[model samples]
Target: KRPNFVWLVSEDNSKRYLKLYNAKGAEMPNIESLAKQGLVFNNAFSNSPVSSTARTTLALGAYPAKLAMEYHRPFERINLPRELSTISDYLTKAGYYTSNDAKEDYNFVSPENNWSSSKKGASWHNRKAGQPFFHMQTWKTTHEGKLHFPESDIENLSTIHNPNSVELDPIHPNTELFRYTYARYLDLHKKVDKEMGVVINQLKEEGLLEDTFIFYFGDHGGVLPGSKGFVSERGLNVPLVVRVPKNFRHLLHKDLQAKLSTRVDGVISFIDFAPTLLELAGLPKSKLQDGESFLSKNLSLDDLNKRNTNFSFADRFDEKYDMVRGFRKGKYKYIRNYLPFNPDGLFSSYRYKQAAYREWKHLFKANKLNSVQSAFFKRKPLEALYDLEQDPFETKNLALLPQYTEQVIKMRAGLQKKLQSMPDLAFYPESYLVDIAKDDPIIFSLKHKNDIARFINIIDMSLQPFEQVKNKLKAVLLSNEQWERYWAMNAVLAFGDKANEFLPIIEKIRQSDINLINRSRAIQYLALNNGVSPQLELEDLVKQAKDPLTALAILNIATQLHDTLGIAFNIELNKLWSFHKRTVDGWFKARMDYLKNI
Candidate 1:
């Protein structure tokens, strides 16, 4: 008989809060108990950061960057490619009853796999006797925001678990909000445990527990300071636990139930999950899935070794402005930032989300957040390296750290090789020209003396005619179109200290621009700088604002500035927030106020 398959996908969760993973405040005893009976991966990862791309990678069993689906933004305008094949498609052909428990948010939806044609949970049990079944269940109750937990439930965790008593990982930063968030994350995990129980009970009630196989994992990593949107171990390290039937325990690795049975760790990838699922369901592999089903029947250990590289990309929330690519092989990880001169920590949202964000916002304004944390805020170094064993958080940046020079070189070459081999249209020769922009010839011209001053000229020329455009821009610099953002950012990096002057320009565009993209662009740069902590020179601008629209322009800057700078200027913002609240809509005014306080 074909065994049953159940995939339980948890959203925005991370191994950070899982007991088996040693996440700080994780409290899922149920999951921990289940893991004891399952094969738990110490190092499993998402191929991409964003949900859309990650899901696509898992569904198609391919790396998103290679498929040109690496970025995380929603796919509202594009249609799913017909050429791609999903695990569901493979299962249906094998005569198994397959049903998605309502979480089919991949890049595409096919009528043949539609829930209408089949039912959600337990539908597989209702199938004709002796047929196989595959069921997919998704849990979103742990996703971020107020919706994940009730207001009353957001109590201080110190009351439940003594914060002082807990010993955190040496690499993990010691921060209050992180502690609080970890506590909340653990609480949420326990809640998910109950939901897991419900599903397990349902299966047992159907007499399928003895034959069914279970796979449980979070969609991605934790949304924290150095994690999530990043490509490091923390960002990519997700939960992957596989529980085979009792009969197959020896096939995986056997241990008595009264004793324990979970045994495995072979470096599995989310991209490999779908293919493995299909193959286990007795189906063939699709050519398009850039993944191999290493875990399933008929695949030898040699076959798994043949599949060596793991590719990942980060492009969502602010992807167009921040395109990054990463590759991991065994313990080594390599990241290539398309924009090299960009200051890595000079831009980020870590300063906007929590109390630590407020405190760090103060530190950044006081010029405090470390250089590493600020790297993503601006153009980053061409590459970064981390020896997972030595620097798990990827904080030390072993890329230039002498001891790893050869490793960095080898990794860099390997990354470029993989990127080149990818079918996506990176157009290597074209990328080389952009790489040339890093040289001194295209930048550091006319010696404008003040680093801040030269940067002002660079920012202003984006809209200025090209012939008269600055020399730095002429050679490698291009138009201000979306595609040219890479070139434009490289130009800004060449400005050095002169980059400071662009802040006023950023503010100016918000006032006069009807072009939404430009307006948003100005805000992005401003937010990036604010995140890094330069005080906004908004006194004159605020005084000049007489109308709601104009006044809003000032508050918008003030709001984000306050997010970074805090309510030190609360008197000023309070007056504005109140006046604006009475005259303008509450949502906009409240949002503006929240930015100021956050």
Candidate 2:
């Protein structure tokens, strides 16, 4: 009989909010209860933020760049290849009756993938007699923004502040947005806890409560500033909890007597989950596993602690070329900005309707920004280093500081070398066709809050055929400054359906744009939303792109289209995918491609 395995995961939640981390004074009683009964790890990370990409990495035990798994970005429908082995595949092959509870938003896979269970509230214990079971369940009660808020609850309250508000380093500036966002999270956690009882009760009813090994974790970090999409500590740091069954408990107790006997203070990655699960189920961790098991003889805490560094990145946003690569070892983090000057913040579709973002825009436009507030106004630097020990919030760039130059150089070289070895797909601007939105601005057009609200409300209702607001947005598209145009594009994308009507505008932008990122963004929107393949436009744009960053942006967007179209048209475009993949083979490759050829 196979042993029972159950992994209950949540999305976009952070350890900062958890009582377990003690970052907050409040006790997360339910989670604390689970931790007391199981192995509670204090320093686990998500590897990346956002659901789609992080989930893919967790499922496959592979890096995000390896699979082009990107946060916020959906998996290209065409990239679904069956050869990649998922955790579910491993369980099925091992003879366990595997199942998942209805949450698979990965970019890869087809109907052919064998998923025994695919619905909420599906029973996991009542399977074929004598067969071991593995059930992967995920809850969305903790998703970001105000969407998950209770319908009857008041949303615009002033009381919502981060419990860890005191933890903000002096280098970090406080924002009301951060305050309110944390408050919303506290409310969501209560709901998630309540629902978890429902799951636990079900297990007891089926007499499997004591028979199954239960593991709990967040899919990624919560929507924290400087953390969610980039490699800041906020985006990557996550929580992990595990409870072994009574039968295995004694064995685990003896084996873990030395480690779990005390406290487990080793750094663990979410990537370790797949291999670790396989080991717990009496399977072996393979050489193919990018992660090591946390178990002894096996993959010890010391084995993992010996590691020098870890890497992470963020990509895949519409109309913007924002890519960040980061490395962390010891107490410092070094981040290389492939497209440094792009806007740090975006007009998020989920929270755009809120007043806070509007207020931020207002202050930003006035240039009354403190050092903290100004970082988001323009594009970033080519490189940044943060002394996490001193400035965890990542507000200060120590790279330029005379004292840290040598440290920065050393970290930069180390990070660059690693980036080259993995060789992500963002290297070659000519091939990938990555979209980078232009910088255009729409001058002040609104007079009152009511007017701005009313205009956006109309967009909220119908942003389809892309033509509904073509007249209004097109004018801005043609004549706005960088920030204004960025928001303008946001308005169009928010009106998802409405953006498709102006397909011709996309091509025109690609043809005439001076900023390569803007051109790339237009190209991506054209292919994805408008069904217009900008292949020829992309090729033309690549040649004229101002820099290596610009060319790469074009290729990223273009390659996504080329891959999807190649499959659609049966044009045998694997070579195109391979070319993009090879071209993006890390920072040295990226730097050489940018400097040598350009």
Candidate 3:
């Protein structure tokens, strides 16, 4: 018998908000009742924290970075490789009806046949009698945008929760605005609980409750200031609970079935989602998927314990551009910032819409914040390591600490292996990938896997003391691959004054690098190290930027440099952005506002 699978997804939620995971969390009686009949996953995560990228990962059952689908809200469409298939395609072919009750932002348009039904009214009830179904119901009440509810809405709230009674995380300032935002998000969680109860009742009314396996989770972590777009535990960790149907216990691993409704602390990621669904349905798993099924007919304790690590990536979230990769293995976590100079709190049009965000930035700029609060706007380290058990908030970085050096080295190597295995396409700028490889990103990535391998080596080298790898770094800078040279320049920037030995190479790149973005990067670094003004060259690059995408790419670099170095390029910025506004859509428009204002 094929049991129906129901996915009840909530928006912008994290483990912090669910009483099932956090005792301090809001009361979710319906969800708590479901847990009594199911398993609680304490360590599940959305591999990519943002909605679009995470949703894409769930849909394709592959690493978004590998597909060049890592960027959020992509301005242009990117196609998946023909070799890949969506969960619906596989399920529909396997004699199961598939439906998505309205949210399909997989970062690509779905084929007409992708889902049997995908609309507001989509449900398993619409399926043929005796046919099993896979249904995904998304609840938007807890969405981050809900945090933007007008002041009058908050004032008129009839909830028991008090805004002033809410506690604040140490990572954020203990300001009134933050507390208010946190409390309101909790109120939304209660609303989300009600939404889940409605669906559970519907399943029961249709006599499908006992026959269906119910899965509940947040779409991704956040509505808070730093959690959504940033790569942190709070950003990626989600609450996942699964209610197993009574008749399906024989299909699950014996030990797991015996421990039904118990909490399991194994690490699971969004990438494993679709494959798990397939395995749960007694279907064959695909080789093309990077995810290993956490639940399989032949599942063993070792099989579950093997999933001790998780990988996550963040890139180009809306108008802001920053490249970050994270790996969590057991209690320790490692983060590599490809662009360390881009602070986590850099301006974003959509992010600042929350009152907490606006207040946080305002306080930081005024120097009215404490060191902990001020850390958000400052430049980040190239590498960060945290003992999550000891420092759950990720405030203490142990990368350079003596006792943690070995752990740091191990995690760094692990992250390198993960990135190269996926052949991370974020090596190049988003615009570059979009223009050159959007149609076939996976194939394009495979073609350059070796190049990415070398780039990873360059990044790993950057973690070493500048003196340890100066010669090797120089060799990479002199290489012909503009992308490799681009990372090598980043290595130079990371070392700062210690890398003055590479001044000659930096000057060479500034004057003669073939790729304009590389040259612009070189100029910015040169200016930082030598105080040499390259405003004229920046202006020329902006003017000669062949296309609007190219101009936007250069400006992403230029804008960061302007913010970091206090160098102005307003005249050229206006001219190029003016042309871009006319030529490109509004996606690129709001980003320009950040550059012009600063």
Q: Rank the candidates by TM-score, best first.
A: 3, 1, 2
Write model 2 residue lDDT over 1-598, tens digit each, in one string: 3458888887787776666765552345666666655667767787676677678778767665544445344313224333346677777777777788878766444345455666775556557887888888888887765433432233444443344463542323455554555566766776676676677667657877456777778888765444456567777877777765665654353444232323456777767778777877777665545776675434444554565456776775432335667788778888776543245654333333344444555666666657776676554666788887788677788988999979987887786565554444333221222222011001111112233333233322222345555676776667645433443554554454556666676567666665666676766666656676665656666666655444544555443454334412111111232533343344223322322221
TM-score of 3: 0.93
For model 3, what is the error of residue 432's alpha carbon versus the real structure, in angstroms, after optimal superposition?
2.3
Lowest-sum lDDT 10-residue window in model 3: 571-580
| lDDT of candidate model 2 versus the reference | 0.58
**Residue range 429-480, candidate 1, lDDT tens digits:** 1112122322221132112124322332344354334445545554323334
Task: Please provide, for model 3 over 64-105, each residue's C-alpha lDDT reduced to its tens digit, 9 standing for 90 to 100.
Answer: 888778877776657867778888888998889999998877
Give the winner by TM-score.
3
lDDT score for residue 593 of model 1 = 46
Off by over 4 Å in 1: 23-27, 71-77, 109-112, 115-123, 146-159, 166-173, 247-263, 298-308, 318-321, 340-359, 366-379, 425-598
Q: How many collisions between residues are there in candidate 1?
A: 12
TM-score for all models, in order of appearance: 0.69, 0.67, 0.93
CA lDDT for candidate 1:
0.55
